Amino acid sequence: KVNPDGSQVRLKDVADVGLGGQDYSINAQFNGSPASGIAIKLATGANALDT
Amino acid sequence: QTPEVGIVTLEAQTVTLNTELPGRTNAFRIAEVRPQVNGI
Amino acid sequence: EDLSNYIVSNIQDPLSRTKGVGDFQVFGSQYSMRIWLDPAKLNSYQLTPG
Amino acid sequence: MLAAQNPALQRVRPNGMSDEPQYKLEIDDEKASALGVSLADINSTVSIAWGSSYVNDFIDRGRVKRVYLQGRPDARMNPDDLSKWYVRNDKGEMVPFNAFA
Amino acid sequence: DVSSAIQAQNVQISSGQLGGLPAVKGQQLNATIIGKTRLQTAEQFENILL
Amino acid sequence: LVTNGQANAMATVQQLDPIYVDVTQPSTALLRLRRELASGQLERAGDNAAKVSLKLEDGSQYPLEGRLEFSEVSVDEGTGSVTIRAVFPNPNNELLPGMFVHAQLQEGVKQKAILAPQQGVTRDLKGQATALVVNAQNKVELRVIKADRVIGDKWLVTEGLNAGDKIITEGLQFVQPGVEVKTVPAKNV
Amino acid sequence: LVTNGQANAMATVQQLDPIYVDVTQPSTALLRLRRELASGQLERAGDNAAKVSLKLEDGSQYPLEGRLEFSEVSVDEGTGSVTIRAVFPNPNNELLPGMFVHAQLQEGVKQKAILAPQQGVTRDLKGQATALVVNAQNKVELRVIKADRVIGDKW
């Protein structure tokens, strides 16, 4: 919002913005260290070794 | 065999810290004429 | 979150166009810049989150 | 309970989840509409400030990603922090949730 | 006005969660918020404000 | 027809040889300024503590300058902004009352303001500002710094970087953090 | 031109060496507070029923402390809130009239209260809170409980 006398508000004054995840629900860890991954499921009607 | 980097060493320096503020001008002396008498 | 962002933004799609991968399950997700509101400074300027 | 004692069965197990406590707040629409607060502004306020709504998308390093909008982890935590969120009515002032919910 | 009222009285609000991630470091409360819910009986659409 | 004491005007009579400017700053910046003065980090401006430089509607700098006065004790309700009044001389009528201008009032001086160039600062994947620094024994290193504001065409870093240290400006596409290389002074000094 | 008793002002001559801080509070919370203070569950005693010690908009504390004045007897029909003003001294113009502040007015204490952690209590099918308790002969029995306020991470 901004009044016509020149005084405005910004999103930096209302909220604290910043980049992060879109869902903090699941976050794995491998062998002690922080990690992540992508669990791959196989397509049906196809073998596993070529995939 | 190892490439070189173009570098700029920085040292201490004083600054002035300007800030920018919006807002519109108004005149020093506005005197809108008002009649304080009646007639045509 | 950063090395989940890396796999979602770079590794996932070439690993998804490949032969015989039907569905993924990414443990985590990418970046998405979030706007963390607080109602104190939201009352300070007479504003609603809409 | 009836199947844990049957000796022909082993490791009988629920595949679901044992159920949680759930905080169901009672929005009083009558007092909300009697104080001038519109009934869509309260829905938008609750949905954005609690449920991390979806608005539009932004570009970072050539790949399009999305933008979420949710209240801070301080004023979202326990049922004492339901009272912090404020809703503007049709007059122009701010009306708290603990006045009518 | 009646259509825009009953598009706003019986909405199924995605109404968040107590202690949803991310949380304050060191608090162990979790409960699902049930906000509004869509009405069921005839005596519940009977009490719709206009 | 005209009656005794009308509400509307009749003919606006005004002079323009000085012209006021009504700029507004938010109260968060004023409270941060009051916190930085009492601490040992920032100081009073001094002798030239009152000059203000005007940026016009088009962006070109107004050549003359004036003084500011009475940072007002009142503050608005629905916006929360402290108004600041400045006075500008105007010999040739370039300024008109009603333009949307940007004043530039100064505050404070920094004693140890560690100050990095612009082409040595590049954002990483997270979104925070980082710069490449060589070590004492000639090897590069990445540091997480914080860039508060930019002045001229050079960043004003606050933490992370230090006094007398070094920042790579030319030759950024051949280095990653860890490879050992030797110091060579660049072009822009 | 000016006239006798015009609408708009000409100059606002404020003094602010003490200040007033109008502080809102919704009527439902004050009604619940009057209920639980008229009950024997809680008491308000001591000299600390008048200190406020407000904090500013950005979370910075205010170094002085003030005194709590009257409470307004009537709520506002557009917001449902009483106003409770207070008096604060600022010797060097620390805060300006018209800001947004948070009062921290101390309600009262509860002498010899017990706190249960959040890992212990879990709700029942009706809505009654309960907590499993080990007896003196080391047998677990069920006991209902009434925990409604969370402080820290303990009910």
Q: Where are the beta strands (DSSP E) in C1-50?
A: 21-27, 31-37
DSSP F47: T
Chain G positions touching C41 (Cβ under 8 A) are 57
Rounded-to-integer distance, Cα G37 and Cα G108, Å: 9
**What distance separates the 2 farthest-apart alpha carbons in chain D?**
71
Rounded-to-integer distance, Cα E41 and Cα G41, Å: 40
3-class DSSP assignment, residue E16:
coil
Q: Contact F47/C14 with Cβ under 8 angstroms?
A: no
Region of F5 please: left (phi>0), alpha (psi -120 to 50) or beta.
left
Q: F126 CA to chain A: closest CA distance, Å?
A: 7
Rounded-to-integer distance, Cα G133 and Cα G121, Å: 10
Beta bridge partners of F117: F154
Type of residue numbered F124? D
Q: Omega into F185 within 30° of 0, i.e. cis?
A: no
3-class DSSP assignment, residue F30:
helix
Query: Cα F172–F178–F179 angle (5° rounding)?
Result: 65
Rounded-to-integer distance, Cα G14 and Cα F189, Å: 53
Number of residues that this document lists for chain F: 189
Chain G positions touching D21 (Cβ under 8 A) are 122-123
Question: Half-sphere exposure of residue F32, counting CA atoms within 13 Å on the CB side?
Answer: 8
Tell me if chain G has a CB within 8 Å of the CB of F12. no
Give the C-alpha distances (Å, rounded to integers) separating A1 from D95, F121, F142, G73.
20, 33, 40, 34
Chain C positions touching F80 (Cβ under 8 A) are 44-45
Chain F positions touching C33 (Cβ under 8 A) are 127
Rounded-to-integer distance, Cα C25 and Cα C29, Å: 10
For CA atoms G33, G35, G36, G42, the dihedral sign is positive
DSSP letter string, chain G = ---TT-SS-S------SEEE---EEEHHHHHHHHHHHHSTT-B--SSTTS----B-TTS-B-SS--EEEEE-SS--TTT-EEEEEEEEE-TT--S-TT---B------B-TT----BTTTEEE-SSS-EEEEEE-TTS-EEEEEE-----BTTB-
Residues B24, A5: C-beta atoms closer than 8 Å: yes
Q: E48 CA to chain A: closest CA distance, Å?
A: 34
Residues A6, F23: C-beta atoms closer than 8 Å: yes
Neighbours of F143 (CB within 10 A): 16
Q: Contact F78/A1 with Cβ under 8 angstroms?
A: yes
Residues B23, A5: C-beta atoms closer than 8 Å: yes
Q: B1 CA to chain F: closest CA distance, Å?
A: 10
Q: How many CB pairs under 8 A join F and G?
A: 34
Rounded-to-integer distance, Cα E30 and Cα D20, Å: 8
To test the contact with chain C by mutation, choose from D37, D42, D45 the residue with the greatest count of C C-beta atoms within 10 A, namely D45
- Spatial strand order of the sheet with A16-21 comes to A16-21, C31-37, D63-71, D53-60
Tokens of F65: 């300058």
**Main-chain phi, psi angles of G36, to 5 degrees:** -75, -10
Region of F171 please: left (phi>0), alpha (psi -120 to 50) or beta.
left
Residue at token pair 């959040």: G118
Q: How many CB pairs under 8 A join C and F?
A: 12
Rounded-to-integer distance, Cα F187 and Cα B7, Å: 8
Closest CB from G14, G16, G99 relative to F27: G99
Rounded-to-integer distance, Cα F51 and Cα C5, Å: 48
Give the C-alpha distances (Å, rounded to integers) separating A38 from C3, C4, F12, F70.
11, 9, 73, 61
**Chains D and E touching, counted as 3 or more CB pairs less than 8 Å apart:** yes
Give the C-alpha distances (Å, rounded to integers) separating G18 from D12, D83, G65, G89, G97.
73, 30, 12, 4, 10
Residues A5, B22: C-beta atoms closer than 8 Å: no
**Chains in contact with chain D (at least 3 beta-carbon pairs closer than 8 A):** A, C, E, G
Tell me if chain G has a CB within 8 Å of the CB of B34. yes
Tokens of G128: 């009654």
Query: Cα D23–D27–D30 angle (5° rounding)?
Result: 160
Residues ≥6 apart with Cβ < 8 Å to F23? A6, B21, B22, B23, F83, F84, F86, F102, F103, F105
Q: Which residue of C has its CA nearest to G102?
A: C40
Rounded-to-integer distance, Cα A3 and Cα F100, Å: 13
**Main-chain phi, psi angles of G22, to 5 degrees:** -70, 130
Beta bridge partners of G44: none
Q: What is the dihedral of CA F15, F20, F21, F24, to 10 degrees?
A: -130
Residues E23, D77: C-beta atoms closer than 8 Å: yes
Which helix (H) or strand (E) covers residue A11, if one does?
helix A11-14
SS (H, E, C) D21-89: CEEECCCCHHHHHHCCCCCCHHHHHHHHHHHCEEEEEEEECCEEEEEEEEECCCCCCCHHHHCCCEEEC
Rounded-to-integer distance, Cα F139 and Cα G4, Å: 80
Type of residue numbered G86? A
Query: Cα D83–D86–A4 angle (5° rounding)?
Result: 155
Q: C31 CA to chain D: closest CA distance, Å?
A: 7
Residues C26, A41: C-beta atoms closer than 8 Å: no
Tokens of G85: 């003003």
Reference D28, options G28, C44, G99; nearest CA is: G28
Residue at token pair 């609690």: D50
Reference G28, options A27, F15, D15, D26; nearest CA is: D26
Rounded-to-integer distance, Cα G144 and Cα A33, Å: 43
Rounded-to-integer distance, Cα F81 and Cα F74, Å: 9
**Chains in contact with chain E (at least 3 beta-carbon pairs closer than 8 A):** A, D, G
**Main-chain phi, psi angles of F177, to 5 degrees:** -75, 110
Beta bridge partners of B22: F102
Rounded-to-integer distance, Cα D100 and Cα D28, Å: 6
Residues A6, F127: C-beta atoms closer than 8 Å: no
Rounded-to-integer distance, Cα C2 and Cα B30, Å: 60
Set out the domains of chain D in order of their start, with CATH numbers.
20-101 (3.30.2090.10)
Rounded-to-integer distance, Cα E39 and Cα D37, Å: 21
Residues ≥6 apart with Cβ < 8 Å to D16? none
Q: Which parts of F55-162 fold into alpha helices (H)?
A: none
Q: Contact D50/E15 with Cβ under 8 angstroms?
A: yes
3-class DSSP assignment, residue E49:
coil
Tell me if chain D has a CB within 8 Å of the CB of E11. yes
**What distance separates the 2 farthest-apart alpha carbons in chain G?**
92
Neighbours of F2 (CB within 10 A): 12
Tell me if chain G has a CB within 8 Å of the CB of F77. yes
Chain E positions touching A25 (Cβ under 8 A) are 21
Tell me if chain F has a CB within 8 Å of the CB of C2. yes
The whole-angstrom distance between residue F140's C-alpha and the CA centroid of its chain comes to 31
Q: Which residue of G has its CA nearest to D36?
A: G78
Residues D43, E11: C-beta atoms closer than 8 Å: yes
Closest CB from G28, G81, G150 relative to D78: G150
DSSP F2: B
Reference G1, options F6, D99, D41, F66; nearest CA is: F6
User: How were these coordinates obtained?
Assistant: cryo-EM
Q: Contact A37/C8 with Cβ under 8 angstroms?
A: no
Give the C-alpha distances (Å, rounded to integers) separating F43 from C1, F46, F107, F152.
40, 9, 9, 21
Rounded-to-integer distance, Cα G99 and Cα G82, Å: 19
Chain G positions touching D31 (Cβ under 8 A) are 80
